[PDB]
Every structure is written in C-alpha cells, then in structure tokens.
C-alpha cells in the first residue's frame, strides 16, 4: 500500500518499482542572448546552449562561439525566464545550494589583436542564481588587449535538485 | 508485492530494499592503444586508463604519459571494443546523450623543443561515441613547435546510464 515519490516510480504494468529513466538523462536547449556584464563594457550575443539533467546535476554545454571583446574580469548572465525548450520550466535550473562558487571550469579562448590570434584561457564559475538569471562569473585568466574573443566548446555543471 | 529494477534491489536477507552498492562506485581499467588522429599526423601509444562508474557518470582517469608530438588541434580515439577489465562490457561506456561536447576538461603538458620543456595546456572534450570508439577532441590550447609531449595526469567524465 505505499506510494513512491520521484525519481522513484511504480511500473504498474509489471508491478515493479524503479528509478525514472529521465532522472539519469534529460536533455534540452536554451535559446537566447548570453549577457556579458562589466561596469565599463556590456554586450549581448545570440547563443543556443545544450542542457543535460543528470541525477541532481544540471550540465551546461557551450558550443564554439565568437563574441565581442571582454574585460580582464567579467560576468556572464543567462536569463532562463524564457528560451528553454519544451518540457523545461525556469525553476528547473535553480541550484540546490547558495555556495559561491558552486563549480568552476576553464574555457579555451583566442584573443584577436591586430590580425593575430593569441591563445589564452578563461576561468568560469557558477556564482549566483536570481529569479531565473544564472550568473557565471569570469574570475580571470591570461589576458591581452584584443578586438574579439573566439570561444572553444566548454561545459560547466552545478548541483540542481528542482526536478 | 512489487519487484525492483536496478539500481533498486530487495535484500531478502533483511527484507529491506536498497540502492545497489556498485551503483555508487564501480572501478575498472581499459588497456589498449590511445589513437591520436589529425590529417597531417597520426600515432598510437600504449596507455592504461582507470575507469570508475559513479551513478550515471563514467569517469576516465588518465595517468601521466609521454607521447609523440601533436598538432595544435587533434582528436583522441579510445577503442573500447576490447581491452576492458573483467566485468565490463563495451556497451558500459556508451554515453547517455549525443550532445557535443558532453564535457570538457584541461590537461597540463610540457612541449619539448630542442631541449627546452615549455608548460602548456590542452582543452579536451568528449565529443563522439561510435560502436565502442570514444572520440575525445583536443580543441586547442597554448602551442609551440615541439618534438614530444609530456602529459600530466588528468581526468574526464561524461554521463552514462548504461547498466
């Protein structure tokens, strides 16, 4: 006579209790503008990110992209209030903790300066979640004066227990 | 009355249902040749990587290694059709999604050029899995002309929900 709460479910067809399949992997996409924020510079770039829900971890998969110039430090804001694919709600991206940072990852970049591409690395950390706005801080890295940045693919994940 | 599907199991000895212990940690090793692929250069090096299955994540643990020279970009192909330790099947390494990249990590290297070791980094992403061959793309990084690469230890993981 007991019931089962997600991710536990009762397969009435076979009278079997199991862990839900979507708990292991739930894919999606967010289409929108990635907001870069710095007191002296701010811009918006049209991006499409792949999302993966694996256990209580949400994975953000940034594809390769070319963006405007950035400061030696900066903030990345992804507004999940809109742009999520079908089946996803804005709440499904809320982290399960307020610890800062939740996770840090490194991104490979190329700074373009007067016709030369300079290899550098850029650190990214999950820092804040405010009302559907995810704030990914860019602490720093090797830097040089540049005109635009070429971003290699990179992924970052943080704990999320919403659904 | 109902039965339980993995990782849920019924301990008949104590009449208790629990999560399988191996679900939390399942270790193993893959022994074989690591294949580097680039149109102008390709080689094979004998390597042994440690594998551990934690929840729906498969972790690859690369030990320190010394390899031949590499291009500024490249792909690493690990053929899991053979070489896995006892208890592991080739299917146990298949990712749970096709998103590219599944995850990216950085590897520390030293490039050898005429007797000088130059510290550099390599971005690595899990990109493709085809009939047991795992494709780890090396998007780029700091580079210099070199004769051989010394690779620091590094780990990379991607979601896998197979058995």
């Amino acid at each position: 006579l007991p019931t089962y709460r997600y991710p536990l479910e009762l397969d009435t067809a076979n009278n079997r209790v199991q862990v839900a399949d979507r708990f292991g992997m739930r894919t999606g996409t967010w289409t929108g503008q990635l907001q870069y924020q710095h007191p002296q510079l701010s811009w918006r770039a049209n991006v499409t990110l792949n999302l993966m829900k694996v256990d209580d971890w949400l994975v953000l998969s940034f594809s390769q992209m070319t963006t405007n110039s950035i400061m030696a430090d900066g903030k990345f804001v992804i507004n999940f209030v809109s742009g999520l694919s079908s089946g996803w709600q804005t709440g499904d991206t809320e982290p399960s903790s307020t610890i800062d940072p939740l996770s840090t990852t490194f991104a490979a970049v190329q700074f373009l300066n007067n016709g030369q591409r300079i290899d550098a690395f850029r650190i990214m950390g999950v820092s804040e979640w405010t009302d559907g706005e995810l704030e990914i801080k860019n602490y720093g890295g090797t830097y040089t004066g540049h005109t635009q940045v070429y971003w290699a693919p990179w992924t970052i994940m943080y704990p999320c227990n919403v659904r | 009355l109902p039965t339980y599907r993995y990782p849920l199991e019924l301990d008949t000895a104590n009449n208790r249902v629990q999560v399988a212990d191996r679900f939390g940690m399942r270790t193993g090793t893959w022994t074989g040749q690591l294949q580097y692929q680039h149109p102008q250069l390709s080689w094979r090096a004998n390597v042994t990587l440690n594998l551990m299955k934690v929840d729906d994540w498969l972790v690859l643990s690369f030990s320190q290694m010394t390899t031949n020279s590499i291009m500024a970009d490249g792909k690493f192909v690990i053929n899991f059709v053979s070489g896995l330790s006892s208890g592991w099947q080739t299917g146990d390494t298949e990712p749970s999604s096709t998103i590219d990249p599944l995850s990216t990590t950085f590897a520390a290297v030293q490039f050898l050029n005429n007797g000088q070791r130059i510290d550099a980094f390599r971005i690595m992403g899990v990109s493709e899995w085809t009939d047991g061959e795992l494709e780890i793309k090396n998007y780029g990084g700091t580079y210099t002309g070199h004769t051989q690469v010394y690779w620091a230890p590094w780990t990379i993981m991607y979601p896998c929900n197979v058995r």
Partner: antibody, heavy 120, light 112 residues
C-alpha cells in the same frame, strides 16, 4: 543556396566615390568575416570581422571605409578618392570565424566581383 | 612589408606531367611548425577558387592531384596528374602577417 552577391556602380569618375554593397544569402554574417580584394592587371584591402570590427590595408587607410549590416546580411564598401591607378575588378571574400587554428587569413568563397573602371 | 614572388611567369606543361610553381617569401611565413600559405585557381572571368589551405591541405571539392609542399621561406606546389580542367592562372597568398599579400600570378598553358 550559399551564395553572396554585391551590387555597385560599374564606372566611377575620377575623385568620385566607388561604393559596392555585398549581400549574403547562405551564411549568417554574425559567424563569418567578409573580406575585400581588388584584382588589377589581387590586392587585399580590408576586412570586417563578425561583431563590427574592421581592419584595413596599411597603405589604403582613410581612403576606404567598410561597414556591414548583420540584420540585413549586407557588407558595404565605400572609397572616397579615386586616381587613374585604382582601376580593378573588386571582390568580396568570406572567412569563417571559428576558434580553430585554420590560419584564418584566407578566403573560402568569392563573390562575383564588381567591375570598377575609372573614367569620367 | 611581406612580399612574395612566384616562379615562373608562364608554365608550358603537357597533361599528366608535373608543373611545379615556386612561391618565395620575403620573410618566413611559417611559425611554430605551421605554414600559413594559400593557393588559388582563378578561371578566366571567374573569381579565384581556393585550392590549398595552410600547408598541403586540400579544400573540400578539390581534386586529389593538386598538392603543395614547402617550408616557411619558400613554398612549391607540384601536380603530376594535370587534366584539361586545370588550365587557369595560379596565385599564392600568405596568412601570417596582418596584411595578406597575394603572390605574383603564374600562368599555366596546357600544350596541344
């Protein structure tokens, strides 16, 4: 069809403005850089990078100006001062903007060119 | 700046006989083991079509016969199978410096 066409006056008077407009149909200009070359009896003049940044030839600065519109998928070239020497077929060339080390100063696809003859 | 000079100005070769075009650069276009040069086939009345990117790499849709090899200071391309299609003029271009300069054109004439 991934093809790009540019429109502009064929003949320009001396000391007139030679302006050609390049239109892209297959690729989003936000991902590609559009270059400009002139073939006289091939010279690289300028490039507009994705994101609006422009770099011109050192010896041609202040006589050529390049702008682009991404929402309209157009690249605009305007030259202010003309001489007898600057008579050539002008072409707009394309390069993809990727993080890969492809040695980026190259041209993947070439538009038809506009024939420029300097005569009053 | 960075000047390139091709050799020769006119090349008279028969089909299936390799004609080698040498492009020599004022400064070494190769850096850190990579060579930043490009070769083009400009047909009469048509814009140039890229043949080789970087060093010895064939662009998509380019015949396998076209091949070039060379180091930073000077680059040469040799093409042993020469069919009727490839009768156009060839230019060499360098991608290292901020202003890329096309090399002097080389004219290939198929003999009949």
């Amino acid at each position: 069809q991934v093809q790009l066409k540019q429109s502009g006056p064929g003949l320009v008077q001396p000391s007139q403005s030679l302006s050609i407009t390049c239109t892209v149909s297959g690729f989003s200009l936000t991902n590609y850089a559009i270059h400009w070359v002139r073939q006289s009896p091939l010279e690289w003049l300028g490039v507009i990078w994705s994101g609006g940044s422009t770099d011109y030839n050192a010896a041609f600065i202040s006589r050529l100006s390049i702008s682009k519109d991404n929402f309209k998928s157009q690249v605009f070239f305007k030259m202010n001062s003309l001489q007898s020497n600057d008579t050539a077929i002008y072409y707009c060339a394309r390069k993809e903007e990727l993080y890969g080390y492809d040695g980026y100063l190259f041209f993947d696809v070439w538009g038809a060119g506009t024939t420029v003859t300097v005569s009053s | 700046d960075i000047v390139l000079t091709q050799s020769p100005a006119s090349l008279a070769v028969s089909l299936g006989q390799r004609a080698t075009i040498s492009c020599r650069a004022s400064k070494s276009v190769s850096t850190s083991g990579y060579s930043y040069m490009q070769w083009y086939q400009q047909k009469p009345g048509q814009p140039p079509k890229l043949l080789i990117y970087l060093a010895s790499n064939l662009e998509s849709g380019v015949p396998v016969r076209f091949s070039g090899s060379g180091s930073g200071t000077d680059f040469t391309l040799n093409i042993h199978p020469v069919e009727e299609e490839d009768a156009a003029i060839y230019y060499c271009q360098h991608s290292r410096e901020l202003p890329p300069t096309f090399g002097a054109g080389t004219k290939l004439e198929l003999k009949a």
